[PDB]
Paper text:
In this study, we investigated a donor who developed a family of potent HIV bnAbs with different lengths of an insertion in a critical framework region following infection with two founder viruses that were closely related and underwent extensive recombination. The bnAb lineage is defined by a CDRH3 length of 22 amino acids (aa), an IGHV4–34*01/IGHJ6*02 heavy chain (HC) and an IGKV3–20*01/IGKJ2*01 light chain (LC) gene. A greatly reduced ability for donor plasma to neutralize N332A Env-mutated pseudoviruses of different clades identified the V3-glycan bnAb site as the major target for PC39 neutralization breadth. Ab crystal structures show an extended CDRH1 that can help stabilize the CDRH3.
(e) Ribbon representation of PC39-55C with 4aa CDRH1 insertion. In contrast to the 11aa-insertion Fabs, structures of 4aa-insertion mAbs 50E and 55C revealed a more flexible and more difficult to resolve CDRH3. When compared to other V3-glycan bnAb Fab structures, 11aa-insertion mAb HCs (17A, 23D and 50I) most closely resemble PGT135, which also has an insertion in CDRH1, while the LCs of these mAbs are more similar to that of PCDN-38B, with an RMSD of 0.48 Å (S12(A) Fig). These differences in CDRH3 stability between the two antibody clades might explain contrasting neutralization potency despite similar breadth. For the 4 amino acid CDRH1 insert, stabilization is less apparent.
Author numbering:
A (entry chain L): 2 to 27, 27A, 28 to 95, 95A, 96 to 214
B (entry chain H): 1 to 31, 31A, 31B, 31C, 31D, 32 to 82, 82A, 82B, ...
């Protein structure tokens, strides 16, 4: 049984009602559907079992509903502790068991464009035989962002790694680094290094660039 | 008050056999109503929960289809413990591994058809690297950004602070990434006013306890 959760990300303010959906590929009895909450760095925690029954100690604001192929987890008034990931699970009469892919409940806030910065490899690193170029996207919302690396106007692929911070506790934004790695040899064969950023807060893509070896 | 305690090596070289055991406290292996389900679950980096396998009260063992060949699940009933082995591990098997208690009971017992008790989990990281301190390189600068690149260390964690930890406003220390070399790398950045680049010193303090590495790196604007 394939369990598909939606939406991927739910964005809400504290105190609003949250509705999370889990769609099964086939009809399943409600007895066999459970829901879990998980915060990062912590084990999951059972919220509901048998579709609608709250587990021990679970607050009244969590409830379950549905039948057939669609089930729902409702949170009637989000508290700060409720911003987390949620998973549905099919625990039937026998294995195998399946989890949904997860839904993230985040704090909603107004759209914010990222500030973009590019960093050439340091002279200290180049002395080592490696070249790393870092593109920074600072304090943006929503989390969805596109970062494309161009070297001498050639789209780069498979030589970059991204890392994203968790949602900020102060202003509810995200920040993101993209790091392009090439050998020192390849770094010195090219002139123009650019990161192109697309984000809902930018009316057109923002490109930050440098020329290798220019002051 | 049921609890699961997990142990086993979490830093694995590639192709080795992952070996984990959980100890049950507060419950018997079968249960009063012969309904206990002892399960293994993993969570790959940035992905959701994936069910691995189970041994139940009657000794029945079942595995997920994509792991059935490489995995073995067993229990030692004399010590109220159960175990998972997973052979020929690769980067694909890097994950946080949990054991959990479920039940299928047929006053109804609590948490029927749910996993109510979970262990703290083991972070399993597959790398042929040995312990290695990071190299620390500067990322040089109305608003100016600067930072440090903390590259090629093993294992986690690294702590990064700025001016000995005084500075946290506008600091972003990014979750580390595992590079293809088996070595971690991360960057730590801070956005500061441009007008402070000549009066305030910015130093990134990097501590890597496994290698006893301690690096204080001044990040200065280039001229």
């Amino acid at each position: 049984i394939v369990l598909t959760q939606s939406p991927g990300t739910l964005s809400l303010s504290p105190g609003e009602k949250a509705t999370l959906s889990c769609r099964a590929s086939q009809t399943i009895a409600s007895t066999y559907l459970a829901w879990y909450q998980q915060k990062p760095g912590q084990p999951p925690r059972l919220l509901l079992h048998k579709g609608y029954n709250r587990a021990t100690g679970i607050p009244d604001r969590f409830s379950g509903s549905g039948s057939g192929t669609v089930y729902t987890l409702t949170i009637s008034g989000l508290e700060p502790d409720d911003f987390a990931f949620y998973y549905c699970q099919h625990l039937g009469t026998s294995p195998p068991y399946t989890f949904g892919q997860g839904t993230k409940v985040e704090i909603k806030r107004t759209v914010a464009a990222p500030s973009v910065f590019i960093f050439p490899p340091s002279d200290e690193q180049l002395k080592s035989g490696t070249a790393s170029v870092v593109c920074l996207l600072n304090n943006f919302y929503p989390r969805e962002a596109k970062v494309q690396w161009k070297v001498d106007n050639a789209l780069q692929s498979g030589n970059s790694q991204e890392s994203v911070t968790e949602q900020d506790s102060k202003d509810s934004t995200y920040s993101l680094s993209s790091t392009l790695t090439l050998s020192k040899a390849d770094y010195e064969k090219h002139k123009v290094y650019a990161c192109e950023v697309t984000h809902q807060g930018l009316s057109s893509p923002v490109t930050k660039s440098f020329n290798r070896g220019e002051c | 008050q049921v609890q699961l305690k997990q142990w086993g090596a979490g830093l694995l070289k590639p192709s080795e056999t992952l070996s984990l055991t959980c100890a049950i406290y507060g419950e018997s292996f079968t249960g009063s109503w012969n309904d206990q389900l002892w399960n293994w679950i993993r969570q790959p980096p940035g992905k959701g929960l994936e069910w691995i396998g189970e041994i139940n009260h009657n000794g029945d063992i079942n595995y997920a289809s994509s792991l059935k060949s490489r995995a073995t699940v067993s229990a030692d009933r004399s010590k109220n413990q159960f175990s998972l082995r997973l052979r020929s591990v690769s980067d694909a098997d890097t994950a946080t591994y949990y054991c959990a208690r479920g039940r299928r009971a047929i006053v109804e017992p609590p948490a029927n058809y749910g996993f109510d008790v979970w262990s703290q989990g083991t972070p399993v990281i597959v790398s042929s690297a040995s312990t290695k301190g990071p190299s620390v390189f500067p990322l040089a600068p109305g608003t100016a950004a600067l930072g440090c690149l903390v590259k090629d260390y093993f294992p986690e964690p690294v702590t990064v602070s700025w001016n000995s930890g005084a500075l946290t406003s506008g600091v972003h220390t990014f979750p580390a990434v595992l590079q293809s070399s088996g070595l971690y790398s991360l960057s730590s950045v801070v956005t500061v006013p441009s007008s402070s680049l000549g009066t305030q010193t910015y130093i990134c303090n990097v501590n890597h306890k496994p290698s006893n590495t301690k690096v204080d790196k001044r990040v200065e604007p280039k001229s």
